[PDB]
Write a protein that binds this DNA or RNA. Structure first.
Ligand code: ZN
Ligand code: ZN
Ligand code: ZN
Ligand code: ZN
Lengths: 73, 74
DNA sequence: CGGCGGAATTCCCCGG
DNA sequence: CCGGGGAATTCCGCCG
């Protein structure tokens, strides 16, 4: 019944404050500590789902932050 | 000098599969044309393809390859 | 020779 | 951790 609030894939639980799948959990972790600067090839509104989440780390990371994901939480 | 890749605008290494392109776009088209051919765009299918952003959308990059006229028979 | 196709190699993101 | 797979550079075979 329950889905990841970022990519809509089935969630593994509440990670960093937000209900997410394992891949988004690990992605957000790597993004914050990598101090990554991502660039969208689109309009920064990109569709993020199970398949398309690979395409735009920028919009995926943005969705993580907007969903409320945080390292200390 | 110089000449630019007609796909991503990076410097072109020569004429590959009929079109002036960089090395990276050469091997990309090779992989894509023999691949699963299912690529999906997360955008509006207008995604900007340049040296920085060409990794982001295989679908749009492949489309630009085709539009530029790239083919295996060349 | 130089140009092109292409395989091989290296690098890195992704996800189980 | 690990393996899978794409990206891009490197290296080689062929031919005009
Ligand atoms: Zn997710
Ligand atoms: Zn995007
Ligand atoms: Zn190119
Ligand atoms: Zn696109």
């Amino acid at each position: 019944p329950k889905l990841c609030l970022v990519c809509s894939d089935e969630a593994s639980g509440c990670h960093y404050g937000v209900l997410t799948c394992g891949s988004c959990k690990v992605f957000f972790k790597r993004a914050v500590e990598g101090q990554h600067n991502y660039l969208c090839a689109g309009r920064n509104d990109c569709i993020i789902d199970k398949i398309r989440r690979k395409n735009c780390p920028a919009c995926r990371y943005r969705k993580c932050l907007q969903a409320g994901m945080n390292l200390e939480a």
